[PDB]
């Protein structure tokens with residue numbers, strides 16, 4: 001097993017910063033977040049989900065500045081978040097015996113938060 | 121298989137005066153419990169967060185009308201952990217999704233309430 | 242199974258309060274938190290982890306004021322923080338059939354949050 005939690009300030013996401021966004025979010029994630037009622041809040045929630053998922057893997061960090069594009073949040077019933085690992089995240093997870101990851105997201109004025117649980 | 125849910129709520133998101141909303145979304149036992157706590161508004165907010173967290177963990181697109189959450193009941197046993205009991209549409213939707221169990225946890229501070237639920241299939 | 246979550250204001254921890262710190266944190270925890278970039282935030286996160294872990298055990302509370310030194314958060318030769326139960330926490334957990342506990346911690350500048358999941 002494994003568990004992850006992450007909390008983010010809504011203002012931590014600068015929607016105007018295309019470089020930051022493009023480096024850390026897949027085109028699909030960007031399309032989803034850009035279409036929500038509160039775009040900044042949606043990106044913040046997705047960012048929290050990426051971090052929560054990473055923490056649940058039980059692996060080593062590549063460094064404070066490594067992009068999280070490899071951890072992709074996809075949707076199920078249109079809006080519910082599912083996890084898809086790619087690249088290094090996929091390798092590291094498989095190397096750790098992780099067979100599945102579930103995630104949930106929520107936000108309010110204070111911050112966005114996400115919780116992930118992984119199965120081995 | 122498996123499922124997870126998290127929800128965060130402002131304490132002020134619950135208006136204890138709004139009897140109509142409370143009646144619609146909380147069971148008599150939930151209302152009785154929350155009404156008896158040191159901070160009533162905070163307790164309702166935590167219970168509300170728990171209902172939302174539990175719903176998100178079920179992996180369903182919605183409960184099947186309406187949006188009311190009375191069907192997801194938080195049961196309390198003094199000095200012990202909160203527990204989940206599903207009724208009505210929530211129970212049907214959960215069973216239809218293969219959910220066999222749901223655990224929940226609640227926390228508050230001055231600023232907000234948060235709950236986390238995990239479901240088993 | 243069992244789940245626990247706890248959220249704390251960073252300012253809820255008074256680092257000056259040696260009595261509170263000594264009563265609730267092991268020497269190892271105190272050393273770790275005291276060495277972090279933000280000491281107050283680190284203690285707050287560790288406190289939240291203790292609370293989250295307790296909630297996941299599915300046991301009765303000894304009271305609002307009971308010390309939590311028995312629930313130790315270890316990070317070191319560890320990637321993710323890990324849980325080690327001692328004393329009464331260990332007995333109570335074993336008595337409840339808990340065989341393992343995982344925990345995760347997150348901070349922003351305002352608050353800390355932790356989530357724990359226990360296995361039976």
Ligand SMILES: CC(C)(COP(=O)(O)OP(=O)(O)OC[C@H]1O[C@@H](n2cnc3c(N)ncnc32)[C@H](O)[C@@H]1OP(=O)(O)O)[C@@H](O)C(=O)NCCC(=O)NCCS
Nearest residue numbers: 055059061062063066067068089286320321322346347348
């Ligand atoms: C380590 C990381 C997850 C922490 O993120 P953050 O938002 O800056 O800080 P947070 O307050 O939310 O979390 C820090 C806490 O996470 C936990 N943590 C640290 N490393 C961890 C790890 N390897 N696995 C799981 N949890 C970890 C610790 O509990 C720490 O708190 P503590 O020191 O008080 O015990 C983040 O900095 C990171 O390295 N992400 C991964 C980046 C990466 O590897 N990119 C490659 C793409 S997959």
Ligand SMILES: CC(C)(COP(=O)(O)OP(=O)(O)OC[C@H]1O[C@@H](n2cnc3c(N)ncnc32)[C@H](O)[C@@H]1OP(=O)(O)O)[C@@H](O)C(=O)NCCC(=O)NCCS
Nearest residue numbers: 036042045079080081105106107127128172176177180181
């Ligand atoms: C999902 C719901 C329980 C909570 O939504 P919310 O009020 O926005 O509060 P939260 O921020 O805590 O949760 C929203 C998040 O839950 C997640 N989510 C959405 N639908 C979900 C579902 N059916 N199952 C599990 N998780 C879901 C999403 O990640 C969403 O964030 P994101 O879309 O930006 O990624 C539900 O009440 C809802 O979507 N309502 C808001 C929209 C609404 O009220 N419309 C009515 C029109 S009058």
Ligand SMILES: CC(C)(COP(=O)(O)OP(=O)(O)OC[C@H]1O[C@@H](n2cnc3c(N)ncnc32)[C@H](O)[C@@H]1OP(=O)(O)O)[C@@H](O)C(=O)NCCC(=O)NCCS
Nearest residue numbers: 199200201202226227228296300301302303304305307330
């Ligand atoms: C129970 C306790 C964790 C609550 O901590 P808190 O930070 O003051 O309050 P929080 O807002 O975070 O959470 C309170 C919620 O915890 C939940 N809870 C209460 N007792 C619980 C228990 N025995 N197990 C799991 N969850 C519990 C309840 O849901 C409560 O909210 P609610 O009454 O509205 O439903 C804490 O007060 C406590 O008594 N710790 C126990 C100390 C102890 O026994 N130590 C010895 C180690 S074995």
Ligand SMILES: [Cl-]
Nearest residue numbers: 085086087090
């Ligand atoms: Cl890949």
Ligand SMILES: [Cl-]
Nearest residue numbers: 206207208211
């Ligand atoms: Cl019923």
Ligand SMILES: [Mg+2]
Nearest residue numbers: 107108128129
């Ligand atoms: Mg909300």
Ligand SMILES: [Mg+2]
Nearest residue numbers: 227228229248
């Ligand atoms: Mg608290």
Ligand SMILES: [Mg+2]
Nearest residue numbers: 007008348349
């Ligand atoms: Mg953070």
